[PDB]
Amino acid sequence: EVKILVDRDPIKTSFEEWAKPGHFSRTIAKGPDTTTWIWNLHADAHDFDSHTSDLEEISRKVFSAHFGQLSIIFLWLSGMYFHGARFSNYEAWLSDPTHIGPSAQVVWPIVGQEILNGDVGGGFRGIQITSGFFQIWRASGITSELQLYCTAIGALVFAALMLFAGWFHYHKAAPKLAWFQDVESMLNHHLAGLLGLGSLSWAGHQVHVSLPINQFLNAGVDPKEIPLPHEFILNRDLLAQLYPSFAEGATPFFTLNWSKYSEFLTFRGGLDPVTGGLWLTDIAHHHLAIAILFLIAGHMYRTNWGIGHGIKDILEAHKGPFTGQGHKGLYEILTTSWHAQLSLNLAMLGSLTIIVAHHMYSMPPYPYLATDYATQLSLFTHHMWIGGFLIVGAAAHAAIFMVRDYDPTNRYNDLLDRVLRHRDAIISHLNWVCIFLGFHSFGLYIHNDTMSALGRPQDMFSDTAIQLQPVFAQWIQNTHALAPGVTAPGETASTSLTWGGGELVAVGGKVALLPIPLGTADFLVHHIHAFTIHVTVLILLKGVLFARSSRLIPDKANLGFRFPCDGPGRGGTCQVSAWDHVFLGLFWMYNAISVVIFHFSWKMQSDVWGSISDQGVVTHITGGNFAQSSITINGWLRDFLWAQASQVIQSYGSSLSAYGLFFLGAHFVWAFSLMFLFSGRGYWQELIESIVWAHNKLKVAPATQPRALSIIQGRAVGVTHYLLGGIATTWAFFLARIIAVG
Amino acid sequence: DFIGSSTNLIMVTSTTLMLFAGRFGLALQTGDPAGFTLADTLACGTVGHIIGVGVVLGLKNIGA
Amino acid sequence: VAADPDRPIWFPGSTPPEWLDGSLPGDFGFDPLGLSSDPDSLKWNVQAEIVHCRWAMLGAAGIFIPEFLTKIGILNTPSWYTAGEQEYFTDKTTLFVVELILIGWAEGRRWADIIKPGSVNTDPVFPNNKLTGTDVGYPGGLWFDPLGWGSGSPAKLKELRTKEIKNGRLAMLAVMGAWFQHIYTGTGPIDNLFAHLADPGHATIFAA
Amino acid sequence: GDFLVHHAIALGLHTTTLILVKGALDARGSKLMPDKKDFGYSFPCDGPGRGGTCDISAWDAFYLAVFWMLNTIG
Amino acid sequence: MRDLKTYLSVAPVLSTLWFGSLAGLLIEINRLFPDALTFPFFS
Amino acid sequence: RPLWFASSQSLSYLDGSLPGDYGFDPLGLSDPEGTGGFIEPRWLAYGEIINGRFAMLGAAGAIAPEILGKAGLIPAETALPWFQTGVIPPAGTYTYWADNYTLFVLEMALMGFAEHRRLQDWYNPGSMGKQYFLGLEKGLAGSGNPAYPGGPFFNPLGFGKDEKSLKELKLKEVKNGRLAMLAILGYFIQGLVTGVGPYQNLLDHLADPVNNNVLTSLKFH
Ligand code: CLA
Ligand code: CLA
Ligand code: CLA
Ligand code: CLA
Ligand code: CLA
Ligand code: CLA
Ligand SMILES: CC(/C=C/C=C(C)/C=C/[C@@]12O[C@]1(C)C[C@@H](O)CC2(C)C)=C\C=C\C=C(C)\C=C\C=C(C)\C=C\[C@@]12O[C@]1(C)C[C@@H](O)CC2(C)C
Ligand SMILES: CC1=C(/C=C/C(C)=C/C=C/C(C)=C/C=C/C=C(C)/C=C/C=C(C)/C=C/C2=C(C)CCCC2(C)C)C(C)(C)CCC1
Ligand SMILES: CC1=C(C/C=C(\C)CCC[C@H](C)CCC[C@H](C)CCCC(C)C)C(=O)c2ccccc2C1=O
């Protein structure tokens, strides 16, 4: 059934098409009559569904494009590991990681920018990075710079291999459509073979290399004194001196006597109190169990043999009573459309990035991550933003499916039809609950603000005036703190210490994630988060559902996914397109993730992070001013924005001065974006035609006719400059704030 | 694995139980009167190993 | 410039490219990247090969002969690598300017000879003098070809010109070998040769 | 600083003036919309045809000039 | 190749080549001649 | 023809034309539907034969320092197993007449000549005989097939005088070669778990087969 259907030499390797730009499209492969052409050359560059009509060439194009992306990421990791090897203080950071700033970038002394090379620590002048690569490397048992250079060279090798792979799998031997459509084998392999064997091999590294090395690094051993990792593979006596279960080898394994493996495959949940990260002993067992699970999960789908679930046979089996035929047809609209799959995988990968952000602060998995408050904050914020962007792109590509790849005649689905038929009910109830949440989450902030301004602090919604305690979250918190016991024995402690009954993991002078107390401010801000998420889903789901038709435009699909409008008629029908809906959902994702990372930064700096002296008195970075000031907007303006932006603006003449520079610059780029979002094309075309008169007066009339940006392009430029500016403002503000007071 | 013990006997019994459930009333081509392929016996023995390890460690932790 | 469809090529079994017909003096079909796919690009790269070859042959001689007649045929030469650090009767930036002014003259005549095939054959001072060279890159004049060997049958001329660039190609390789040797290895090239001939095994590029 | 902010002020005045003068002189029409006098001073647009005509009216010149005016007076 | 040079002459590739060369020029000038506010030659 | 674990997909294209076929293609890499690149039935059979010949040379040479190294014919220092000879300096390096890496460059140069000429007979078999190679290009023709040149430098004394004899000889070839490939895999896994030579792994089994098997030696080193 499944096979390796692949055809040779379909496309010629030649620069002939490089010389002819815009070759991929018909209207673009004839010349730039205008300047918009170049914007259409980049816009449609990766719109392979519009270049061709057959799915075979599209699948080959995106396959080799994924290979290019993997080449890029291998080259990026090459850069990171190399810069760690040569331009870093990692060899010194291992000695005193609680006081040396992790730095992996040095600037060139030319124009005074050598101030950026600051006193990170370790006898090294550079930039205090906030990526957490140093923490990984301590978790990977690197203990050198040679290993990092070798890793960089190997990553460069794999980058070149992936580049050759894309070239081979497009130009030399490109797979045909029967190969991609065999999703059964693809899932069987990516579950068991990528995620199963990948987690298994990382468990092997974690058992053989990370665990024995971190058993010494945490035990006051200098990295120069540690035995090399391969010495544990060659000499098992040195490995057994700390974990004697290796003296028996795999006889405990194959005889199912796993009870004599707990020296290195543990379940003692919680954070290693010597470094603040999770127990690597638990992470080895984790990735091992995940290997078992993905290995049994990747033998689920029939590929060639009589066993396995045909995914058609799973989907067609589910047919609801008043839900109609049910999931029949979905295997044909997911295997004959890349955009549907792209949307699904984007949505899940984005929510997974967010879950990563959430589980990487509350269960610090790397050593000296929780105490590197810059790394923790930056990683949470990063992955939150990536998740929001991926979800918003999932919306865009659901819409693109609905416009292009949706065919109720051939590739019919029942549930999608049922969703389209009461789409007004969906959007009406979402448009209601967004207003309800908006009111009962932000009008509460307004109420607190007014009551505090009228001198009525006894009337706010605070932890002192009117109790809005998260009773449900408090119950989950208290039962997860008292989870070690009847419900989860053999764990020795809670799976995390972000719950009230937990304890404080004092690492050096720092505090590293004691319990998080949930009060009225957490209720208010969590409902603000639900609000912003619900409005984003309103906008995006509305764009997806009404991508094809509305009461306003019933032929919206014929106009396309990415179109500005259908004229000033009907009172005006700007931004009816799903592209414009996702362009608005970008702003709302921005507001959502911005208030999310603000909640994170403030709740952490006030209720979690800080410094605990040897007497035991923990003093937080702000001073616990979240539950009292995060109930009103003036606190976010005063105690969070105004106050914590006293280290990014005062950082002029310091090592953190590029942060204030990009603070002002990202401010600027955001505001500059407002020139695009607010304005319209017609003014700029008329202005351009005036200055084109000024040029034609001097025989400087360019043949590529100067055209103002297309409307959808003005909206794209506006949203990208707006997001870049707000996000770089926040990035600079967070990084300078959290590196300065640290 | 020190054959004749409880873990080994339990494992062999579970593996043979799953192989029997496969050969007679299911749950690498025609080489058996019942159409039992190499992949079918591989599958049945692997899930037999799964249940065997599960029940072995479940008797170890509580009981045996 | 007669084609040879069945000439021996760099990679036997391969099909040499269309733009290498066999006409050139020493074209074994070695152009995988296609850096001479164009006709004029080929005509330029030919003279580039010729002059890199000739400069590299003069370089290989002035490296190894002063390094061969110094280690055994005893003389006193400082080196080939650190000869730029040594001092002479002129400042280091001065004689660089002088040899630039003097070499740029000839190289401008060469530029003219390449752009316009026959333009610089008359001596501008004494127009009775001449260079009897029809082929670009091979000026058959007295100062270059006084012994009359650069003329005759085009087949003998082709075998002689491929002899030339054959010596010149490994001269290029030898000069950059001396470069990479004096960098990786400390001592000079002929000393590297003697250390290789002492123990061919434990004397190579490898040291670990 | 007074020099630099006076030049910022000049930027603001010249730019607000640019927006307003351009709207006023292209109020009757331009090349993109030569019969703009027939649509009046305040009209939304002329449609997505001819590349797009968002904010083409002289009213919208006034609009974006109010933005630049607020900026300048700020 | 003629088409490779046609691509190298394209506006972005030639723009980044031109601005890399230019940026190296200004960079090496601001390293050899740093911290410059006034033109002192024939001042 | 015999069909040992032959899928219905497999025997559509495994029509007995290849030497030593038994229908065993459960995966289907030799399916001729498309299958460009290196995955193709012709290159796959060629690679089978070549890895088999090299594995025969391996399984003979990885243990010849032990089957007649313990018998006394060979000295003791030149009697190490396959993994202590110098191919893994982490496991052991014998000091040969040269450095361990100049010998690798020797391999690369010599086998580069040999194997690139083999490749250029694979692509177009009419070559290797049209180009002068120090006069010995006459017997490098590669008459009819790439895996079976039959030249006077590869088949000096005739064995394929009849296609029956040549077919049976190719069958014996591929069978001994597959056996040697399995042997090399056994060598690698045995030296990976036991860290001892393969002939010693045989002798520990022959002495007491019960406590010397894969079962009891599941613990490594
Ligand atoms: C280097 C050798 C080489 C050559 C000469 C070609 C030649 C060709 N390819 Mg192939 N290709 C190659 C390598 C090569 N390819 C590799 C390595 C891959 C894997 C990624 C592909 C994948 C591929 C696909 C999927 C497709 C082609 C196509 C084409 C044709 C048109 C390409 C074009 O005009 O866009 C030229 C484009 C560029 C020069 C730039 C592309 C971007 C590169 C890959 C990465 C950019 C990295 C950069 C750092 C990121 C930006 C950040 C920056 C701001 C810092 C042409 C025949 C197309 C075709 O034939 O369809 C009709 C097609 O669909 N190629
Ligand atoms: C798995 C991830 C993924 C994949 C494979 C795709 C793939 C695609 N998307 Mg989707 N998309 C994604 C994520 C993804 N996108 C995300 C995360 C979002 C949310 C914003 C979107 C939103 C989105 C929309 C709204 C649209 C697409 C479209 C497209 C298609 C064409 C895009 C194109 O040609 O632009 C080629 C590349 C460019 C034009 C460059 C973009 C320039 C960016 C914005 C630069 C600035 C960002 C940078 C990080 C900041 C540094 C600045 C510095 C350089 C100074 C293509 C099928 C379009 C489509 O299908 O049209 C019919 C379309 O309309 N996508
Ligand atoms: C602070 C600026 C701001 C405010 C207040 C709003 C307000 C709103 N937006 Mg808008 N929006 C904004 C900026 C803003 N937006 C920007 C900059 C963009 C650009 C992308 C958008 C894009 C946008 C879209 C695309 C969508 C919204 C939606 C919404 C609504 C959700 C909240 C709601 O109705 O709950 C209640 C109202 C509030 C929370 C607003 C504050 C009001 C306070 C609490 C009380 C007001 C006083 C009270 C009534 C007394 C009256 C006194 C009397 C004298 C008048 C609401 C109309 C969504 C919508 O319409 O569906 C729900 C939607 O789909 N907005
Ligand atoms: C100075 C450099 C140079 C240049 C410009 C040429 C130019 C030419 N050669 Mg010659 N050649 C050279 C050196 C050079 N050769 C050397 C040193 C060898 C021996 C290794 C050869 C062997 C050779 C053969 C066998 C043949 C040619 C042929 C040709 C022609 C077609 C190929 C082409 O477009 O080349 C253009 C070449 C370049 C533009 C130079 C490449 C520049 C890149 C950056 C090189 C980078 C990688 C390199 C390996 C690193 C050098 C390290 C070094 C220390 C080893 C053209 C006239 C063919 C022909 O028609 O003969 C007349 C032919 O059959 N050449
Ligand atoms: C437009 C506003 C503006 C102005 C006027 C300046 C002006 C200056 N900046 Mg500032 N700067 C600006 C914006 C501005 N900058 C912005 C936006 C940034 C952020 C990107 C910076 C960031 C910045 C830094 C970080 C630094 C400067 C520096 C400088 C000084 C550069 C002097 C120098 O090296 O030139 C020397 C001249 C050249 C590089 C040009 C050489 C041109 C070649 C040689 C051709 C000319 C010869 C030609 C053949 C003709 C000869 C005559 C004959 C043949 C006919 C100068 C005072 C540097 C400094 O020293 O500050 C005081 C410095 O360190 N600036
Ligand atoms: C996304 C990754 C990916 C995917 C899905 C494919 C898929 C495919 N490739 Mg491509 N390929 C890739 C990456 C990928 N390749 C890369 C990165 C390279 C460069 C190294 C190549 C080079 C390549 C060539 C040269 C050829 C293919 C071929 C094929 C096809 C058949 C392969 C097969 O049956 O397996 C067969 C697999 C084996 C026989 C095993 C190979 C043994 C190696 C040495 C180890 C593989 C394990 C891997 C490295 C992980 C271990 C890591 C290690 C450190 C432990 C199929 C269309 C062939 C084809 O039919 O043309 C399309 C073909 O000729 N590919
Ligand atoms: C000119 C030259 C050397 C000149 C040396 C001189 C003057 C030396 C002078 C001195 O020593 C003396 C006398 C005395 C010393 O005291 C001082 C100095 C001053 C040091 C070397 C060129 C050296 C040039 C070299 C090594 C060129 C190598 C090119 C290669 C390998 C090309 C490969 C390809 O281009 C093809 C052929 C075809 C394509 O399709 C594919 C690829 C693969 C790209
Ligand atoms: C998310 C992401 C990231 C990261 C990632 C990572 C880090 C991952 C990892 C992953 C992994 C870590 C993976 C792994 C994989 C693996 C594999 C894929 C393997 C394979 C193997 C094999 C296949 C083998 C086989 C064998 C052997 C040898 C043994 C026995 C026999 C057999 C044959 C079975 C980043 C940040 C960059 C960006 C974004 C995205
Ligand atoms: C400013 C603006 C424009 C005009 C924006 C223009 C066309 C961008 C300015 C020209 C760009 C910067 C290209 C010029 C640079 C070229 C690459 C040429 C190179 C020249 C040197 C710099 C190398 C719109 O078309 C528009 C449309 C809809 C809503 C809002 C707006 C909007 O706000």
Curated annotation (Swiss-Prot), chain A:
Any single GO BP term: photosynthesis
Sequence positions that bind phylloquinone: 684
Regions that span the bilayer: 62-85, 148-171, 187-211, 283-301, 338-361, 377-403, 425-447, 523-541, 581-602, 656-678, 716-736
Catalysis: reaction(s): reduced [plastocyanin] + hnu + oxidized [2Fe-2S]-[ferredoxin] = oxidized [plastocyanin] + reduced [2Fe-2S]-[ferredoxin]
GO cellular component: chloroplast; chloroplast envelope; chloroplast thylakoid; chloroplast thylakoid membrane; photosystem I; plastid; plastoglobule; thylakoid
Major location (coarse): plastid
EC number: 1.97.1.12
Alphabetic keyword roster: 4Fe-4S, Chlorophyll, Chloroplast, Chromophore, Electron transport, Iron, Iron-sulfur, Magnesium, Membrane, Metal-binding, Oxidoreductase, Photosynthesis, Photosystem I, Plastid, Thylakoid, Transmembrane, Transmembrane helix, Transport
Cellular localization per UniProt: Plastid, Chloroplast thylakoid membrane
Residues holding chlorophyll a: 675, 683
Protein's membrane topology: Multi-pass membrane protein
Cofactor note: P700 is a chlorophyll a/chlorophyll a' dimer, A0 is one or more chlorophyll a, A1 is one or both phylloquinones and FX is a shared 4Fe-4S iron-sulfur center.
Any one Gene Ontology molecular-function term assigned to this protein's record: magnesium ion binding
Annotated binding of chlorophyll a', by residue: 667
Positions of [4Fe-4S] cluster binding: 565, 574
Any Pfam family the entry gives: PsaA_PsaB
Similarity comment: family membership: Belongs to the PsaA/PsaB family.
PANTHER family, sorted: OUTER MEMBRANE PROTEIN, OMPA-RELATED, PHOTOSYSTEM I P700 CHLOROPHYLL A APOPROTEIN A1-RELATED
Name this polypeptide is given: Photosystem I P700 chlorophyll a apoprotein A1
Source organism: Arabidopsis thaliana (Mouse-ear cress)
Higher taxonomy: Eukaryota, Viridiplantae, Streptophyta, Embryophyta, Tracheophyta
Swiss-Prot record, chain C:
Residues annotated as binding chlorophyll b 4: 110
GO biological process: photosynthesis, light harvesting in photosystem I; response to cold; response to high light intensity; response to low light intensity stimulus
Induction per the UniProt record: Induced by low light (LL) but repressed by high light (HL). Inhibited by cold.
Residues reported in the UniProt entry to bind chlorophyll a 1: 30, 36, 49, 169
Statement: the UniProt record of this protein carries the keyword Iron-sulfur: no
Cofactor note: Binds at least 14 chlorophylls (8 Chl-a and 6 Chl-b) and carotenoids such as lutein and neoxanthin.
Positions that bind chlorophyll a 3: 164
Keywords: Chlorophyll, Chloroplast, Chromophore, Magnesium, Membrane, Metal-binding, Photosynthesis, Photosystem I, Plastid, Thylakoid, Transit peptide, Transmembrane, Transmembrane helix
Protein residues bound to chlorophyll b 1: 10
Subcellular location: Plastid, Chloroplast thylakoid membrane
Membrane topology: Multi-pass membrane protein
Family of the protein in this entry: Belongs to the light-harvesting chlorophyll a/b-binding (LHC) protein family.
UniProt subunit comment: The LHC complex consists of chlorophyll a-b binding proteins. Red-emitting heterodimers with LHCA3 and LHCA5. Binds to carotenoids.
Protein name per the record: Photosystem I chlorophyll a/b-binding protein 2, chloroplastic
Species this chain originates from: Arabidopsis thaliana
Gene encoding the protein: LHCA2
Section of the entire sequence shown: 46 to 253 of 257
Swiss-Prot record, chain D:
Stretches assigned to coiled coil: none
Organism domain of life: Eukaryota
Self-association state and partner proteins as the record states: The PsaA/B heterodimer binds the P700 chlorophyll special pair and subsequent electron acceptors. PSI consists of a core antenna complex that captures photons, and an electron transfer chain that converts photonic excitation into a charge separation. The eukaryotic PSI reaction center is composed of at least 11 subunits.
Family per similarity comment: Belongs to the PsaA/PsaB family.
Compartments, record wording: Plastid, Chloroplast thylakoid membrane
Identification of the protein by name: Photosystem I P700 chlorophyll a apoprotein A2
Organism: Arabidopsis thaliana (Mouse-ear cress)
Portion of the full sequence shown: 515 to 588 of 734
Protein's job: PsaA and PsaB bind P700, the primary electron donor of photosystem I (PSI), as well as the electron acceptors A0, A1 and FX. PSI is a plastocyanin-ferredoxin oxidoreductase, converting photonic excitation into a charge separation, which transfers an electron from the donor P700 chlorophyll pair to the spectroscopically characterized acceptors A0, A1, FX, FA and FB in turn. Oxidized P700 is reduced on the lumenal side of the thylakoid membrane by plastocyanin.
Transmembrane spans: 3-21, 61-74
Binding site for [4Fe-4S] cluster: 45, 54
UniProtKB/Swiss-Prot annotation, chain E:
GO cellular component: chloroplast thylakoid membrane; photosystem I
One of the Pfam families matching this protein, by short name: PSI_PsaJ
Membrane-spanning residues: 7-27
Disulfide-linked positions: none
Keywords of the record: Chloroplast, Membrane, Photosynthesis, Photosystem I, Plastid, Thylakoid, Transmembrane, Transmembrane helix
InterPro entries recorded: PSI_PsaJ, PSI_PsaJ_sf
Membrane topology label: Single-pass membrane protein
Source species, domain of life: Eukaryota
UniProt GO BP: photosynthesis
Subcellular locations according to the entry: Plastid, Chloroplast thylakoid membrane
Family under the similarity heading: Belongs to the PsaJ family.
PANTHER family (UniProt xref): PHOTOSYSTEM I REACTION CENTER SUBUNIT IX, PTHR36082
Function according to Swiss-Prot or TrEMBL: May help in the organization of the PsaE and PsaF subunits.
Name of the protein in question: Photosystem I reaction center subunit IX
